[PDB]
């Protein structure tokens, strides 16, 4: 039985996303606590000492910066190279489907002065795992994120680079390192012990025509090798005050970063996560499953940053959160389609291998919980509201 | 003093490209020798036990297939995986500038069932080295080719893969295998010493162009094989195969300087590459395409001659302006290197003037304001 929907009284987020005694999410408390307790000058000195520790004296890379060429990864790599005198190799786990602006931003990243190693996993395997994750979990990104989180550490192992810097805030407030990942390497020995897109590796090979090579790209970094090679993952948001709007204007100035030419569906923003077309369906699934769409996440980030008030947040959520993303829907349906030509085995496992709109909407219904949705000739039972 | 231009009597190529006693290029004789002496069934058997030797059982990659997702690299990876039961990692040294169809073909490659590791070198460094190679050698691809040739062996070392298979004919006919003072080493006609000294580069900027460590190659038993040794390589076959199995997309329009639509269509700078070879050697893209098709038996020397006469001297206008911008070394992106150039921002007039400085009078004669070739290939 699911929890009754309550909204946080600082941001516009709900308790459904996968609160304290004043009804405030941990996220608002961490942001507000950081906006008093953090001395950014002494964090700047810690960054300069970390760079001194790792900076390469020869012509080798001293730094791995993962990212898609979005405003955050652009800021991270650009400030590490041209302000802290680092030599980052940039590395990209490929999106499902490049947006035009997303591809231009990836190129602008490279053309700001960076080598880039882009890994694009087997497109057939990726589509099958994405379709399975949509069918089983209504979570297209589930397999993708397993590969993404593994990629940068594995790339540091391959190029024998020790330092990995993510252009985002730390996972644990106060700690610039993350290290938990070892539990991913164990998850194994058995058939139905490991899972991918809500399907066991055993049944992927058994029934969907996959082999162990098709899954090599998704395996986590070997923790023995990580420890052995002294690979350290750092979060640049620990060391530098991370402000998305600042990263946008910085990336426009120094890189020619291009915002989405039109408003991102489901939200009001134009420069948050704009490289992957399937991003649209990701926020539709979370909306369907948890009653909170993309405008909720964007407005919550902007309320904590101090760029908007909770009242403007509530107005934006009300206007945009329930918008369906039509622009790429048809390409995405084709991407999710498991045809006989490309998938001689896997295609037969699906009742409707070729996805259309009606099938996707029917599938969405099966993830729409009646404690969040009531029909109107659908509508949220509970929308975020302004404070009393 | 340069050699007087003679054309080969089998194909339509000249002796200027960087002949025997019947006036036949070595390339025509080697194609003739191959279409007689080669038992392709026995070459197929040799391929099957190259594959047996290297095939991986533990679900790791057992081979590296380099390429851009053009018809050849598509064929190589697709036939190795789906016919010879290999598990290739595909590997791409990025082009200067993706064509739209080129990028869609690279994606079609990945979506035919291949993991791909794409290396895109520092775009500023690449533009500066390409502009230098254009100024000094009239050879935009020179630094690109150094990096490209190094890439696949280095990738085999990184992923700890032993077998590298190029989707092309062998370099040496008959064998399928390939075998401190900064003012000594050169890149785009410029020494490493002067690149760092005067153009604002460091050792890291040039790391991507360094060759594979030969000690590491020998130690890890990395073998480069050429698939054209083992399989009868026919460009047009690779095209129709790649269309059938991958949705390979030809150029929507005829490639400038030639008649073809699916030979090397991924890099916009490919246009200027064939213009420079024409300017320096009197032979453009139609000469290379027609010569290949004459040896394959698909056209006669006379059709070749007609195609060279109509297409070889075409200037590639479609991407000219984007390429001039690509070669432009502005102050924002190159605060140091920009000042080294008399005209940092390239335009058409500067490119044409620079071309003139490479147009040798033993190959080109003026006719009013139109350059014409002193010697064009003839039917004979
Ligand atoms: Zn909150
Ligand atoms: Zn010849």
Residue numbers in the entry:
A (entry chain B): 37 to 54, 73 to 233, 235 to 242, 246 to 435, 438 to 448
B (entry chain A): 37 to 54, 73 to 233, 247 to 447
What are the paper's exact sentences on this?
N-acetyl sugar amidotransferase (NASAT) is involved in the lipopolysaccharide (LPS) biosynthesis pathway that catalyzes the formation of the acetamido moiety (sugar-NC(=NH)CH3) on the O-chain. The reaction involves the ligation of ammonia with a sugar N-acetyl group, displacing water. The NASAT family belongs to the AANH_like (Adenine nucleotide alpha hydrolases-like) superfamily, whose domain forms an alpha/beta/alpha fold for Adenosine nucleotide binding. Members of the NASAT family carry a conserved PP-loop (SGGXDS, where X represents any residue), indicating that they may have ATP PPase activity.
